[PDB]
Homo-oligomer: A and B are copies of this chain.
Amino acid sequence: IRVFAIPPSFASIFLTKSTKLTCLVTDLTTYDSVTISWTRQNGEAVKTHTNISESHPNATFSAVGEASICEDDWNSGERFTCTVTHTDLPSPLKQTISRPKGVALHRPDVYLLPPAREQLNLRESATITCLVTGFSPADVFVQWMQRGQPLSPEKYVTSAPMPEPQAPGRYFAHSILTVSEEEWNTGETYTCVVAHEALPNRVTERTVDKSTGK
């Protein structure tokens, strides 16, 4: 029985085009008359509450906290919390949700890697990785395109940003794309963009063909 705190991961904020700090409950079971407030330690209204999601009764609740907030105001670094005024939990919960300060914005040195000879001698799949490397902010979102048309995570997956061991301050992350080898062997561009807050343009892209990778 605890209100889960969900800081806005850059993946989610670039999926929904807006920063999203929420307080969704995870282990909270069926308790009717859900009264959960969105106020700080001083008391302030909600920044344009929108996108109410239904509470699926499958042994959990969905305490709505979704809101659209300006990215500049998000990067200004304001302290805010989701106090709990529910009947089950009357005591407030301290959920300090903001980007980790004391951080140097280091852009992701992005290296897109075509597959090696080991898929050329098997001809079953070409798992092409857009390995992002060396960026101090942890969260990052990697998605791909065929030409300019984006590609869904049903063919690819962005691995979690576990830290880089050579530079403890920086992190890295990872992402693949698993499709047929023939579709990659047509000389068609798989252009992986990399959304990150430390980039100057906030989105940088690399492309590989059958000839771009040597």
Contact = CB atoms under 8 A, between A and B. Distances in A.
A113 B121 CA distance: 13
Contacts of A115: 111, 113, 131
The copy count of this chain in the complex is 4
A127 B61 CA distance: 42
Given A157-B165, A157-B172, A214 B116 contact: yes
A159 interface: yes
B204 A193 contact: yes
B155 A72 contact: no
A143 interface: yes
Interface stretch (A87-95, A96-104, A145-153): A145-153
A121 B187 contact: yes
A187 B120 CA distance: 9
A104 to B, nearest CB: 14
A178 interface: yes
Q: Which of A71, A119, A174, A200 has the most C-beta atoms of chain B within 10 angstroms of its own C-beta?
A: A174
Contacts of A191: 204
14 contacts: A14-B201, A17-B72, A68-B72, A69-B70, A69-B72, A111-B116, A117-B209, A118-B207, A154-B165, A157-B172, A159-B174, A166-B179, A174-B176, A201-B205
